[PDB]
Nucleic acid binder design. Structure first.
Ligand SMILES: [Mg+2]
Ligand SMILES: [Mg+2]
Ligand SMILES: [Mg+2]
Ligand SMILES: [Mg+2]
Ligand SMILES: [Mg+2]
Ligand SMILES: [Mg+2]
Lengths: 106, 197, 136, 172, 190
RNA sequence: UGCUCCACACAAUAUAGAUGGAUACGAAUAAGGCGUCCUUGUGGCGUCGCUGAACCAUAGCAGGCUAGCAACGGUGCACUUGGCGGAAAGGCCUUGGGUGCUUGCUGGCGAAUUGCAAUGUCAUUUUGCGUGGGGAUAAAUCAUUUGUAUACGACUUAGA
């Protein structure tokens, strides 16, 4: 039709951090439309893709992906924690991610 | 959900609006703030004028041109508040601040765009009834902002054209509502009503 | 020739006022105010929808325009009998406010097939409405 | 401490050969749980009789429920408290549906208006006023007028979203 | 304290119509029309029987209820000024130098000029507020009468005249010269 | 055989981060919106809110080929009529017909093997290069010169 989306939008906020030490191994994601941990429990274990573009074609594509998954909820406001096979680059704080509906339980 | 979010700054509390926008910018949302001159600060006009004068007196002693710049315009007073809530010396903070535009009044192209409010930062909701508050336009004028009159004149001109647009929109909305009400009680409408629509 | 004043109608905190609980185990049920404890807390009772007699803060409940005649301090059986006599549920269900609550609950319950049907019906209704707007 | 609870605490001196079966003193204690109630009991028996926890024994502790939790009552409360410069007695009136929440209101009131911590307060007495016109504080007396009804002007609605498209109203 | 309701009553007479906006009061009577902004008080007006208006404060504190009685007086002064009017009379007080008070005009401005105050060569100009009427009355000497439907304007114009003749650089207990309000009353009182 | 604009063709370059729609009164908030009527007002009456949990859009090989019915609507694209918009207008509203689609309704055909998933590629920026179609045909600096200038630069004058 006009929309072909099968993923929920999300935003890469930052790494897990204290006041003055961050941890790139874990990322904080805001899922569009999730406001509480109770809602954020639905997306636990779902796969996240970060989709970006590069100038150099690699394997028949100028588009590249970093694949991760939602591990747990974070705070009271629906923010979740995500882990990616390679850590997100930290210039993507504020950048969009795609949270897929697979693996699917409902 | 919008690509650009236009906030009408009228009747908002400057610091609570500032924190909201600073979080929005850092989270990657482009924000335009209009009618900066209609922003509110809680407290009397004298208190806030005294606070700006205290801000005015601090400057690099040996060269006043390398010191704390004291911007007078309301949009810049808002911008200064929003800086300091943004780590503005970093690349991430610069990229956040580049997602923001603050204007006096409503200029084009935002005249014909939806303006939102932030109820979290609205004075009418936050401030206790009877509490004295300041308007950023008269604060800015008292500390040296020059363009309150031109802003007011252009805003009156915009409000007149906008009221005329609204009169036409209201007439069409009336006609649309009448056609939709007439279509009700038909078969398709009753099936729709059984589905919450 | 006459004094004109805007009345500024307000829902009053009063015995026999009907309230909708928004926070807690009830959260969407109708109760009646039986006592006023202080400026912020009122004793409420919702025996028809099963709200226990309790002291509740006014900030977690929303006053409705509906009121019914009820003595102050009326016990649960008295509250229920006068609630049935005044037919508070039926007056509530007639309100566009309750219609809107039922509407959003019915919308949330729709399946994927039901949503697809809603699209098809909306397009058909739109077809008739647009044709009418063109003719008028 | 979702709220206070009221316990009856009965204790006695330890029995001796000289005096078997001592006198069994009892108090009503407002405390968050059993342990605090027993501690408060000994602390107050410290000030009345020659006995301490080591020379004494807790015979019974029983939570005391409100006889009618769903009846609004006017409570008169006598408290003794230590301010920064001395000790003072006062009497306050609290309207609510139970003794425990009336006392809970009282501790909040003492903290707010006199900066009196729970550390620095003695509940001398709590008693319902069974008759109107024995109520003496105007802040509770104003609520007993016939057919009382007031509005709640300037309703402020809580928004779940960050942005509103409507420029709201405070009507009610 | 937080009183639940505090209540005040404004009585309106036979030939007066009082219209209240959000909190903009318009009082119309025999002598004209007054308007007053009261959007700083947070009170509620309600019409009772076309002879009684009730203004109330709900869940108000000490300063709030004090403002309520203030509002009642302000509306009362509107109704009094639109039916009976306000008339302030001032007396010229001078020991040696006679005070010369006249009404002059400059491009339609209607000033009150004080000349010869303590023998000063400076002429004192006090503007006449809109709605205020100045007259100098026969049968009693050195007196100026200010009249109007607005008590605030009549009183402030009278105060402006009294203040402009403040003796400077002298013992004011000995140098009493000035123009002093001597009577506060009504125009159509009889 | 230079420069500039347009159009289409390939290259390269990147992306602070498209993935249905940024969806326009103003003002008050101890008040308002909408509708209706009149004696056009600080009017009567009705109605609404208690969130956008909305409205709009939205089905078709990432959306194919093809047959009809009903209506004369919707919408796209260029060509076009007029008007408005200077705060940063660069957009808004319209007119006319033309050329498409239309899922408002009823059909017939196609899809497969990307193999049980791999963004599975659909966007908008900049700069080149080529082709074909319009358009225009300068200056500045150094050197020389002045002294209203001047440490040197700079400044300020003159010179087919
Ligand atoms: Mg970060
Ligand atoms: Mg963290
Ligand atoms: Mg500095
Ligand atoms: Mg708007
Ligand atoms: Mg300056
Ligand atoms: Mg002297």
């Amino acid at each position: 039709a006009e929309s072909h989306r099968l993923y929920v939008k999300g935003k890469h906020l930052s790494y897990q951090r204290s006041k003055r030490v961050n941890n790139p191994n874990v990322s904080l994601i805001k899922i569009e439309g999730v406001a509480t941990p109770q809602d954020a429990q639905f997306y636990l274990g779902k796969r996240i893709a970060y989709v970006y573009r590069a100038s150099k074609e690699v394997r028949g594509s100028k588009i590249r992906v970093m694949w991760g998954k939602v591990t747990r909820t974070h705070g009271n406001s629906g923010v979740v924690r995500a882990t990616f096979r390679n850590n997100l680059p930290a210039k993507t704080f504020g950048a969009s991610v795609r949270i897929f509906l697979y693996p699917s339980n409902i | 959900v919008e690509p650009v979010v236009v906030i009408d700054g009228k009747g908002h509390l400057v610091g609570r609006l500032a924190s909201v926008v600073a979080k929005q910018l850092l989270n990657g949302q482009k924000i335009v703030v209009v009618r900066a001159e209609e922003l509110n600060i809680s407290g009397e006009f004298f208190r806030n004028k005294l606070k700006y004068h205290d801000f005015l007196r601090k400057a690099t002693a040996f060269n006043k041109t390398r010191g704390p710049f004291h911007f007078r315009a309301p949009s810049r007073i808002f911008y200064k508040a929003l800086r300091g809530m943004v780590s503005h010396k970093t690349a991430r903070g610069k990229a956040a601040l580049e997602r923001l535009k603050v204007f006096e009044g409503i200029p084009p192209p935002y005249d014909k765009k939806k303006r939102v409010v932030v109820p979290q930062a609205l004075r009418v909701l936050r401030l206790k009834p009877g509490r004295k508050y300041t308007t950023l336009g008269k604060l800015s004028t008292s500390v040296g902002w020059k363009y309150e009159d031109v802003v007011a004149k252009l805003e009156a001109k915009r409000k007149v054209s906008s009221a005329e647009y609204y009169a036409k929109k209201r007439a069409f909305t009336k006609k649309v509502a009448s056609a939709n009400a007439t279509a009700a009680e038909s078969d398709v409408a009753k099936q729709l009503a059984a589905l919450g629509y | 020739t006459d004094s004109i004043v805007k009345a500024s109608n307000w829902r009053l905190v009063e015995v026999g006022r009907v309230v909708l609980i928004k926070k807690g185990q009830s959260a969407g049920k109708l109760a009646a105010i039986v006592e006023i404890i202080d400026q912020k807390k009122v004793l409420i009772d919702g025996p028809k929808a099963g709200v226990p007699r309790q002291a509740i803060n006014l900030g977690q409940v929303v006053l409705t325009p509906l009121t019914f005649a009820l003595p102050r301090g009326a016990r649960t059986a008295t509250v229920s009998k006068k609630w049935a006599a005044a037919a508070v549920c039926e007056k509530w269900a007639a309100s566009s406010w309750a219609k809107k609550i039922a509407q959003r609950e019915r919308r949330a319950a729709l399946t994927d097939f039901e949503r697809f049907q809603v699209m098809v019906l909306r397009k058909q209704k739109r077809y008739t409405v647009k044709k009418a707007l063109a003719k008028a | 401490m979702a709220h206070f609870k009221e316990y009856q605490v009965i204790g006695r001196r330890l029995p001796t050969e000289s005096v078997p079966e001592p006198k069994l003193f009892r108090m009503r204690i407002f405390a968050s749980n059993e342990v605090i109630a027993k501690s408060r009991y000994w602390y107050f028996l410290q000030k009345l009789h020659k006995v301490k926890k080591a020379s004494g024994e807790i015979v019974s502790i029983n939570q005391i429920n409100e006889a009618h939790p769903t009846k609004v009552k006017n409570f008169g409360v006598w408290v003794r408290y230590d301010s920064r410069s001395g000790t003072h007695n006062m009497y306050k009136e609290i309207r609510d549906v139970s003794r425990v929440a009336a006392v809970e209101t009282l501790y909040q009131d003492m903290a707010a208006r006199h900066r009196a911590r729970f550390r620095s307060i003695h509940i001398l007495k709590v008693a319902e006023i069974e008759k109107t016109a024995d109520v003496k504080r105007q802040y509770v007396k104003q609520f007993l007028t016939k057919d009382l009804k007031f509005p709640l002007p300037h309703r402020v609605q809580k928004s779940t979203k960050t942005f509103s498209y409507k420029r709201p109203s405070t009507f009610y | 304290m937080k009183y639940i309701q505090t209540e005040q009553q404004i009585e309106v007479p036979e030939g007066v119509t009082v219209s209240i906006k959000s909190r903009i009061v318009k009082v119309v009577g025999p002598r004209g029309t007054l308007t007053k902004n009261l959007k700083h008080i947070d009170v509620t007006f309600t019409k009772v029987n076309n002879q009684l208006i009730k203004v109330a404060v709900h869940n108000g504190g000490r300063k709030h209820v004090a403002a309520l009685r203030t509002v009642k007086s302000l509306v009362d002064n509107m109704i009094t000024g639109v039916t009976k009017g306000y008339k302030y009379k001032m007396r010229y007080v001078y020991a040696h130098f006679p005070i010369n008070v006249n009404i002059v005009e400059k491009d339609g401005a209607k000033f009150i000029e004080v000349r010869n105050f303590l023998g000063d060569k400076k002429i004192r100009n006090v503007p006449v507020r809109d709605g205020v009427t100045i007259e100098f009355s026969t049968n009693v000497k050195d007196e100026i009468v200010l009249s109007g439907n607005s008590v605030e304007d009549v009183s402030q114009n009278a105060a402006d005249l009294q203040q402009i003749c403040r003796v400077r650089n002298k013992d004011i207990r000995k140098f009493l010269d000035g123009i002093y309000v001597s009577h506060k009353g009504f125009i159509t009182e009889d």
